Symmetry: C2
Subunit: 206 residues, 2 copies
């Protein structure tokens, strides 16, 4: 078969989306989780000095979005047409811009930077969430299938669903008045093969 | 197929797509808005921002998604799915790089308060050194001269245009990277692209 090796830290973060893709494609792969010191040794042989890095039959591929998209195309979770795929691509990119806005809150609460959690929540996180959910909700209200794009699962369903499940861990109010976003999160994570992975994967915060 | 690129009267995020149409000899509507006309159309855009591309009325936002979509249509995305992915990662790396230098970039075009010189010497140049380190590595291991595979792909157009733009503000930008200089020249010498470079509206970025 094609052999796959996901290399990333001992956390979900940027590597998780790809791990969910393999779970849903029932695709077996090597799932390498590194500590700081192990990373420091392999780092210079990585295409951009960072992780996640995927290997397909030895050949290296960096950047989480590129990884997830590549794997989604192989297994049928990218979109059922080239334009639909592009629409999925834009949701993924929007989500990434959203991650930049909340970077300050997100790295404070995992505790790898110091700051005031509470005003970062109120002033940074929640306004960025309101804007972003405003867009997500619009795609959901105009999708009667229940997925963000088209009539089936695509990998942005997995990004947006996992992020929201993760954030409820730190901010229980997070999906406070957005029932359609709540619905989506539940719908996707109820897919038995995904739920299985959720139950069996190593438990990490974020 | 009718195409409509909507963006501001600048190159910035919209230019990559404009270069794709130039190279595909694809005619399209090229809509450049001022602040006040944007403010009026903004709420009907998918994420409230530009660039937005329309294919036969169907709206598509996010510059990377636009460029990749158009590249696939016209044959500039990569000649396999993995090669396309490798092109995707270069594009994404470049975008991370844009985040690092955001503070310098908006100060020097003068649409932001700033401390030019330490931003240049402490922010811009170290981010460039790291980024060019990667770009150079792809170039040294590419016998064709393009960042990926043996032909033009849309990241060639992003990286080439950004470097030409930055030389405008920082003339020492490419100095200790002749291979990056080469790449910039190689791509922008492609006649169809050079013709667009000579005929497009001149803007200060
Ligand atoms: N755009 C990159 C960002 C990922 C990233 O920054 N990962 C960090 C871990 S938090 C890394 O690999 N190294 C951190 C470092 O050494 O700077 C991606 O999606 O892979
Ligand atoms: N992250 C988006 C860029 C979206 C964006 O910030 N667009 C700018 C122009 S370069 C804009 O429209 N700014 C004004 C606004 O959001 O109202 C992309 O990757 O295309």
């Amino acid at each position: 078969m094609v052999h796959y090796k996901l290399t990333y830290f001992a956390i979900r973060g940027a590597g998780e989306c790809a791990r969910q893709i393999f779970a849903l494609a029932d695709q077996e792969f090597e799932d390498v989780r590194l500590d700081k010191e192990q990373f420091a040794k392999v780092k210079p042989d990585l295409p951009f000095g960072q992780v996640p890095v995927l290997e397909v039959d030895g050949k290296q591929l960096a950047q989480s979005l590129a990884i997830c998209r590549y794997l989604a195309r192989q297994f049928g979770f990218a979109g059922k047409s080239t334009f639909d795929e592009a629409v999925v691509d834009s949701l993924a990119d929007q989500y990434s811009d959203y991650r930049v806005e909340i970077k300050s809150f997100f790295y404070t609460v995992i505790g790898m930077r110091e700051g005031d959690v509470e005003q970062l929540k109120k002033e940074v996180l929640l306004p960025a969430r309101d804007k972003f959910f405003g867009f997500i909700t619009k795609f959901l209200k105009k999708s009667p299938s229940g997925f963000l794009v088209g009539d089936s699962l695509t990998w942005v369903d997995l990004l947006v669903s996992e992020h929201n499940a993760t954030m409820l861990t730190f901010v229980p109010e997070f999906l406070e008045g957005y029932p359609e976003v709540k619905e989506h999160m539940e719908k996707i994570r109820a897919i038995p093969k995904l739920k299985k992975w959720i139950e069996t994967r190593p438990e990490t915060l974020f």
